[PDB]
Design a protein around this ligand. Structure first.
Ligand code: DKJ
Length: 389
């Protein structure tokens, strides 16, 4: 472990998002910022909102620069409108550097800020191609690398607790690590396996095979990447294209058929509860996602447990029961490897070598019988044909 200053610098959870502490302006204004690999805009609340306890005050920053331009970002459900500008930015539990970066000062928003989340802004870590208004708005990570000696790489260890946490427990507990400029070897076990970044827009990857308890889903691999497959810390669930979702749910139901669950559970709408400590993890199957490797005709696999895809939630009666929602859902915008997936792994965003590394997380939730896995190599032909165009 050679990045001690950055270890344990995250807080939060899969459902409301993981955040890092940052400061903006002169003198520094402290804000909690959502770490999002599924967007490319750095934005902060800059006007009072019922869910914000603090916000960026441009008139109190002597280093604030007005870009005199409007900006709008529509997300999956939420959205915001704001005003573009620049300021000095630092990450207290990050590299010991200050950079001048673009900041969208949020003036209006709908279903963006989450009550009790503890975050007041969003750090879009993806590439300029998906930045709004357009690709001329340099994302924060690009500015950081260009202005400093920080290597063009970041890595994320998201730590799911495996049980519910209220707002107060979230504040008090460590939610993970964001290592800026390096790979901290204390955050994972086993080997790091790398998948290519197909195109620099979202963090786009190629899934070449899917298994449920070792049983091949047997779909044309193009289906798994229709119309794209992305790694997104800003999305909670594992989201699958409609056809893949229907086939995966049918297979997960058949594997867990010793117990019957209502349709609302499988639709990700209603919770299922079990008496304290009796969740039957063993009846639920493991899920393997095979990803294209860096060597020609070579693949590797990442394997998750129900401890990853069953999201802990507090009971409607707040009882001693262990309650969960099914964290797999349909998508009409391709595969999304969200926070519940990422929680099983140490993920290295190697922008310099246009590749994503995965290793078993030192903080993944498991039992005495099974663990999450990263294994290879596998001989896999015609992998570039799995890519949708
Ligand atoms: C749940 C969701 O919308 N997730 C958000 C973050 C976010 C987290 C949050 F807690 C509250 C939010 F309102 C927003 C991700 O950025 C998504 C947005 O859509 C896609 O990106 C589209 C754009 C590039 C932004 C135009 C891609 C799947 N990444």
């Amino acid at each position: 472990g050679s990045f001690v200053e950055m270890v344990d610098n995250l807080r939060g959870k899969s459902g409301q998002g993981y955040y890092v502490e940052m400061t903006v302006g002169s003198p520094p204004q402290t804000l909690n910022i959502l770490v999002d690999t599924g967007s490319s805009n750095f934005a902060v609340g800059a006007a009072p909102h019922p869910f914000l306890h603090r916000y960026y005050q441009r008139q109190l920053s002597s280093t604030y620069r007005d870009l005199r331009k409007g900006v709008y970002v529509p997300y999956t459900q939420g959205k915001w409108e704001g005003e573009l500008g620049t300021d000095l930015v630092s990450i207290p539990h990050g590299p010991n550097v200050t950079v001048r970066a673009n900041i969208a000062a949020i003036t209006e928003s709908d279903k963006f800020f989450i009550n009790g989340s503890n975050w007041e802004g969003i750090l879009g870590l993806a590439y300029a191609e998906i930045a709004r208004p357009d690709d001329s708005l340099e994302p924060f990570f690009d500015s950081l690398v260009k202005q400093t000696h920080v290597p063009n790489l970041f890595s994320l260890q998201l730590c799911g607790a495996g049980f519910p946490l209220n707002q107060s427990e979230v504040l008090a507990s460590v939610g993970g690590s964001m290592i800026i400029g390096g790979i901290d070897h204390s955050l994972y076990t086993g080997s790091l396996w790398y998948t290519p970044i197909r195109r620099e827009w979202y963090y786009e990857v190629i899934i070449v095979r899917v298994e449920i308890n070792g049983q091949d889903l047997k779909m044309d691999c193009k289906e798994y990447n229709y119309d794209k497959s992305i790694v997104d810390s800003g999305t909670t669930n594992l989201r699958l294209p409609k056809k893949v979702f229907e086939a995966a749910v049918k297979s997960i139901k058949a594997a867990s058929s010793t117990e019957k669950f209502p349709d609302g559970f499988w639709l990700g709408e209603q919770l299922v509860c079990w008496q304290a400590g009796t969740t039957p993890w063993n009846i639920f199957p493991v899920i393997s996602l095979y990803l294209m490797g860096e060597v020609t005709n070579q693949s590797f696999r990442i394997t998750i447990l129900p401890q990853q895809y069953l999201r802990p939630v507090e009971d409607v009666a707040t009882s001693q029961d262990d309650c969960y929602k099914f964290a797999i859902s349909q998508s009409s915008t391709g595969t999304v490897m969200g926070a519940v997936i990422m929680e099983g792994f140490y993920v290295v965003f190697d922008r310099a070598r246009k590749r994503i590394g995965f290793a078993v997380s030192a903080c993944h939730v498991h039992d005495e019988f099974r663990t999450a896995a990263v294994e290879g190599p596998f001989v896999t032909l015609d992998m570039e044909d799995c890519g949708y165009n």
